Amino acid sequence: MRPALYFCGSIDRTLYERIVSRLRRFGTVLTEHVAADRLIHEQDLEWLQQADVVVAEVTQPSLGVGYELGRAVAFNKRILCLFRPQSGRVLSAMIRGAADGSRFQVWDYEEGEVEALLDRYFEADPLEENLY
């Protein structure tokens, strides 16, 4: 089966659909139907552990997104966070500070470039190798 990708965002919808649509080129997006409480917590936890990579849109402040990122770090997951400074917000220091430039990355982006940034991210460290 294809790699499993976890898309994390705040429960924007047009941008989230573009992110999920692009990530489907790299594998199954486990949270695709969520994008489209104990039971919810358990299901997201099951999917986070299954994920090969966690891609989180962290522009909208969310306790849920933050919590899933904290659990993901504790699971030693490969994490990419996407933040849009054009929102006007200052990203939480806890999320910027968690970055280590390798396993946990935080990229500031402009809405128009998100598809190109996701291709860049998987070209540098693919989940499936390219054909010859």
Indicate the annotated binding residues for 5-hydroxymethyl-dUMP.
9, 11, 62, 64, 68, 92
Residue 36 binds a copy of itself (CB under 8 A): no
**Residue 60: partners with Cβ closer than 8 Å, 6 or more residues away:** 9, 10, 12, 87
- Apex CA 24: angle with CA 114 and CA 129, to 5°? 95
Report the phi/psi class of residue 17: left, alpha or beta, with left for phi > 0 and alpha for psi in -120 to 50: alpha
The interface partner of residue 12, options being ligand A1IZX, a copy of itself, none and the CB cut-off 5 to 8 Å by kind, is: none
The residue with tokens 């999920």 is 20
Among 1, 36, 63, 124, binds a copy of itself (CB under 8 A): 63
Residue 15 binds a copy of itself (CB under 8 A): no
Residue 11's Cβ-side half-sphere holds a number of Cα atoms within 13 Å equal to 10
Distance (Å, whole) CA 83 – CA 59? 5
Residue 44 binds a copy of itself (CB under 8 A): yes
Among 64, 105, 115, 117, binds a copy of itself (CB under 8 A): 64
Which of residues 7 and 26 has its CB atom nearest to ligand A1IZX in the complex?
A: 7
**Contact footprint for ligand A1IZX (CB under 6 A):** 7-11, 16, 31, 34-35, 39-40, 43-44, 62-65, 92-94
